[PDB]
Design a protein around this ligand. Structure first.
Ligand SMILES: Nc1ncnc2c1ncn2[C@@H]1O[C@H](COP(=O)(O)OP(=O)(O)O)[C@@H](O)[C@H]1O
Ligand SMILES: Nc1ncnc2c1ncn2[C@@H]1O[C@H](COP(=O)(O)OP(=O)(O)O)[C@@H](O)[C@H]1O
Ligand SMILES: Nc1ncnc2c1ncn2[C@@H]1O[C@H](COP(=O)(O)OP(=O)(O)O)[C@@H](O)[C@H]1O
Ligand SMILES: [Mg+2]
Ligand SMILES: [Mg+2]
Ligand SMILES: [Mg+2]
Lengths: 35, 97, 23, 97, 371, 371, 371
């Protein structure tokens, strides 16, 4: 019974408005991070 | 690290303290050849004038039938090593079965 | 080396062990 | 080794007595020990045939080394299963605590 | 759900939440056990003391360090360390909080196996990750390129990274840090007359090392200065009221990092380890490694180490390079801080080892997920 | 006069006479210096141990290898190595004996300059030659044509020869051999818990690699077999009495020869080096390079490497043509053996660099007289 | 000119010339001062008594040990000790004899400063030297490699040496020896009804410890044997005629060497100290260390200690090593006897600290010249 129990097959934020593109914003966010 | 007479007397005695497998294998690889023995018995002059190489071969040839003694000494040491490595393994295989 | 070749062809332990037996 | 020791015993027995009185007892002891090793190998063959009839394999096809490697890996799996079940029981005990 | 960062250092456990600047629980990792005969019955006489309680009552306790050179030897003691830092210090349930853990590189894998098994079955978290300390120190530095020397209480390791790419063949490990400096200070404080033998006196010798010692700019000139005049001699007060004064041992003790042969180790110093880790890299990044020498850990907190470290690298490097040691004034907790930015990173949320992945793959996915 | 052959490789100096079968003096090339404080006085405490004495007494010594990737870095150490292999091992006078030294191709020229100058002015000979090791391995193989892969302790180099003609543009050098395998095995034995950091422990890891490691025929199936069951695990006994047992590191360690990216090298494996060395030649000889793949060096002494490299080249070569690896049982000493036939050759006696020609031409004849 | 060897131990001064079995003056290092009212006039009353004269009249004296745990506290008493062992015990002038002195390891340097200053200004010598006791013990053992456990009356130290090279990081010091065993025997003789509180009674307790005590092979079995039947009980007679009988205290007293928690001390026993000093060494020499254990000093003179120490180390060491302990019958004075070895050596004549070198360098050259 325990073998049949175990080893059976289972039954089947506000919007940040920006005038810039994404790449320049992420490059500036990388650039301002190290300060 | 000793004189040649000690080596020849220890080969004649058959003592196996510092004669392992490799030294006797080297000793078998340098065996005195036929023309070497024929040149050594043809020597009549003073013994001290010749080299140590001739001195070792004459001290070795002084022993009657040196080569059988060297080979059985090597084979006895090798047979002891083969027995010590195989017999507990064979007993382990029999005990495992 | 040439002048060397020219010039050629031409105990603590027992002392202490003796005196340890005096005490 | 036994063939070399038997050839060595035949060579010593044809030689002079000075070789014989020093070496024949060691040659005889080595030959007797290797003969006892050969009946030990024959006992290993008899247990191998009994194991092949035991495990229901062919006698000519059964390899003892593969069987012992299977037993070694099975014993390692046995110990790993025992430790994993013991850790599972312990972690269930601490979870209940 | 807020994440947990728990730097399990060899000498100090630093644990705390994500998004915070200062680590919430910084306390030494010691398990105390009483070695004397208790005669007063009752009044809560515990069989073990963990943390600051072991520190305050250390005069009747044998203190055991569960972590030795980054490898956890005693595991029931380290389970007590984790139980104390989860339930008593931070006072949080571990089963409702992800927990980033730190690790020295070139650690035996069975340590990572047993930490993964304990953190998934004893203190069963939703998720945990085993990171590398030098990468977190580079996170707290804020830059991307650089070589990181991390020196703690057991492990001093050098890891170089260029543009977020570590070089695993260039990572170097040395088992020489602040515990070895403390034991060397014990060996050399016996010269002046002060004897410290017990593990209770280890905290006193460690406190003397933290308060008074400093790194010499030039070793031989400082030895001549201390030998000539007693101006470098400084005083300290013991808990039993005795006043000690030390001279050359102020700078003989941290000099073992630059000269390992004081404690009988064949390895070279941390400056030569840094220079060899630089020269094990590819050539074009090496200049970018020279201007970004990041130094972290509490062992690099002596107030003379940056100038000496710059002097040694400037001696080792060619003269057309600007050596710049990045030694921040708060470099003691930078591993935890970079763990806090990494735990608060939005891209890190897909890299956690979950409970379900552990149940599918056994305790072996931590080799195949972590670095 | 008999001649001397001295393969002065990175790891093991193999020296002996001419016309002999086996190299008489085989010993590793290390200079050992003490690193502790000697308290006993008398009974001959030497400051430098060379050869087997450095191996026997290695527990108090720092061992330095004077040769790194075929290029001699420390020259006084190599002077002591040559002094030991002439005066103490062979017990010969170099002033009355010719000498054939071995050299890897694509070596810096000033290394050859210093070999010529020290060999002609410290151990001044009647004659000396510097040969390529792969040509001597083809001499040992007993055939005229073939591609030779030599792999010592520092250099794995491929040289193809057809009917006596080496193609110099097809010669390739890879600085990856048994020392890098030893260092990678020191890196990966730390996973199982065994820590090896000193130069003396490199010899123990080298003995582990020589005694237990083998080349897998298929890497992924062997990793799956070692991960599934512990049948591939094998045990070894350390000199302190501890017994180790290793698994996949038996065949992960020699896999760096076929996968150089394990230690961070960009270059391809030895099979791709052999195939590119064949493909760089002219077309009509390439068939004769497929059937005569001569192997040499001690790195190719693992008992799984010939079938593996046959499988890799047979995958790489066109299928209408036979691949045959020439792997002799004595391929460890084949550089010395082919040096012994070449030293005993009658036609070689005009190709010696005599002392008179050295005095006339300076140390510059070795660029134009040798290869 | 014959040299002088003067082992100034914590308990017994052993002094004499060079090259003797027994030291010529073996006497305890006590200075006696009277504590009662002297009512008789004249009859040779002395204000102080040194040596066996203080031992004879010990009932009316307070005895002071100037050396405690290898560190000399009272210096005028130590000057009286040196004046008595020069002018009365040996009856030789100190101005015409070089004097080798012994020293415990990890001694405070000011002790060396003060013995150098007193030996060069009060008992001014041609030369003097300060040496380590374990090196002399290894000299008297007649070997070169091995680990030495010295155990006198204040200091028990372990020093491992391989081929004449001591390892200073592996030297261990333990302040537990026969004075602490005498105090513990005073503590446990109070159980059976016998009280010993004065310093004169310390000699009686030390005599009981010397004569009757022994080391048990198995502790708990001997507890069961002593508790069950009174076969182990032995008798002793005091000088006033009283008779005492002791049982388990015969083998509870030396057990503090193998179990230091009896007198309340955190550090481990002498066999764990020996094992940890072995494992602090490099890995290749330990097999030479296990077969060459050396015990010296009077504390290892119990007739059960070698078999017990063999059992404990064979429990600690792996089973493939032969634990051989050298325990000669002459080991009570072997620290002196190896001092007879070193002072008679021809290679030791250039290492003495002469008068002139002291005159330029002050009393500070003894640090740079000695160990
Ligand atoms: N002000 C200080 N000066 C010198 N050393 C210090 C100072 N503070 C702490 N340390 C040392 O640094 C260690 C703590 O380092 P830590 O940052 O915890 O590294 P890890 O987490 O790897 O243990 C302590 O063991 C201590 O010896
Ligand atoms: N039986 C072996 N099995 C595997 N590797 C070996 C074996 N013997 C030697 N080696 C490895 O190969 C090298 C020997 O090659 P060799 O050409 O003699 O090197 P070298 O000449 O530079 O000393 C050694 O460094 C060793 O690591
Ligand atoms: N036969 C013995 N059995 C047991 N203990 C002894 C014996 N002889 C001496 N001792 C003890 O060993 C101690 C060490 O002796 P020793 O090394 O001569 O002391 P020190 O040299 O430091 O004065 C002494 O204090 C003595 O009590
Ligand atoms: Mg840390
Ligand atoms: Mg080679
Ligand atoms: Mg003493």
């Amino acid at each position: 019974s325990s073998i049949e129990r175990l080893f059976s097959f289972p039954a089947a934020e506000p919007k940040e408005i920006t005038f810039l593109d994404a790449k320049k914003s992420l490059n500036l966010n990388i650039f301002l991070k190290q300060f | 690290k000793c004189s040649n007479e000690e080596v020849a007397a220890m080969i004649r005695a058959g003592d196996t303290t510092k004669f392992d497998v490799e030294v006797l294998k080297q000793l078998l690889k340098l065996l005195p050849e036929k023309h070497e023995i024929e040149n050594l018995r043809a020597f009549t002059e003073e013994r001290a004038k010749l080299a140590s190489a001739d001195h070792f071969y004459l001290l070795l040839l002084a022993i009657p039938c040196y080569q059988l003694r060297i080979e059985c000494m090597l084979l006895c040491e090798g047979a002891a090593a083969v027995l010590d490595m195989v017999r507990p393994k064979a007993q382990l295989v029999l005990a495992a079965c | 080396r040439k002048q060397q070749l020219a010039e050629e062809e031409a105990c603590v332990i027992d002392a202490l062990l003796a005196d340890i037996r005096k005490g | 080794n036994l063939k070399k020791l038997l050839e060595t015993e035949r060579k010593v027995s044809a030689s002079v007595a000075e070789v014989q009185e020093q070496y024949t007892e060691r040659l005889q002891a080595s030959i007797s020990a290797f003969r006892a090793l050969d009946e030990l190998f024959e006992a290993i063959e008899q247990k191998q045939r009994e194991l092949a009839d035991y495990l229901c394999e062919d006698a000519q096809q059964l390899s003892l080394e593969d069987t012992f490697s299977t037993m070694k890996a099975f014993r390692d799996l046995f110990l790993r299963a025992l430790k994993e079940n013991k850790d599972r029981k312990e972690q269930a005990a601490k979870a209940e605590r | 759900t807020t994440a947990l960062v728990c730097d399990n250092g060899s000498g100090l456990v630093k644990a705390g939440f994500a998004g915070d600047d200062a680590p919430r629980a910084v306390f030494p990792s010691i398990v105390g056990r009483p070695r004397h005969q208790g005669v007063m019955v009752g009044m809560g006489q515990k069989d073990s003391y963990v943390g600051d309680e072991a520190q305050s009552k250390r005069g009747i306790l044998t203190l055991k360090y569960p972590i030795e050179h980054g490898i956890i030897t005693n595991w029931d003691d380290m389970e007590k360390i984790w139980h104390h830092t989860f339930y008593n210090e931070l006072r949080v349930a571990p089963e409702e909080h992800p927990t980033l853990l730190t690790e020295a590189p070139l650690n035996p894998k069975a340590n990572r196996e047993k930490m993964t098994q304990i953190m998934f079955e004893t203190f069963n978290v939703p998720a945990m990750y085993v990171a590398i300390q030098a990468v977190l120190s580079l996170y707290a530095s804020g830059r991307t390129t650089g070589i990181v020397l991390d020196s703690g209480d057991g492990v001093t390791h050098n890891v170089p990274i260029y543009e977020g790419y570590a070089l695993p063949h260039a990572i170097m490990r040395l088992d020489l840090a602040g515990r070895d400096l403390t034991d060397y200070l014990m060996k050399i404080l016996t010269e002046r007359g002060y004897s410290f033998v017990t593990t209770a006196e280890r905290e006193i010798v460690r406190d003397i090392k933290e308060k008074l010692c400093y790194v010499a700019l030039d070793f031989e000139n400082e030895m001549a200065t201390a030998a000539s005049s007693s101006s470098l001699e400084k005083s300290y007060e013991l808990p039993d009221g005795q006043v000690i004064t030390i001279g050359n041992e102020r700078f003989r003790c941290p000099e073992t990092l630059f000269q390992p042969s004081f404690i009988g180790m064949e390895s070279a110093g941390i400056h030569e380890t840094t220079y060899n880790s630089i020269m094990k890299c590819d050539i074009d990044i090496r200049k970018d490694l020279y201007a970004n020498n990041v130094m972290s850990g509490g062992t690099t907190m002596y107030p003379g180490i940056a100038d000496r470290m710059q002097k040694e690298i400037t001696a080792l490097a060619p003269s057309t390079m600007k050596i710049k040691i990045i030694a921040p004034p708060e470099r003691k907790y930078s591993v935890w801080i970079g763990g806090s930015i990494l735990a608060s990173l939005s891209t890190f949320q897909q890299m956690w080892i979950t409970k379900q992945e552990y149940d599918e793959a056994g305790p072996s996915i931590v080799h195949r997920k972590c670095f």
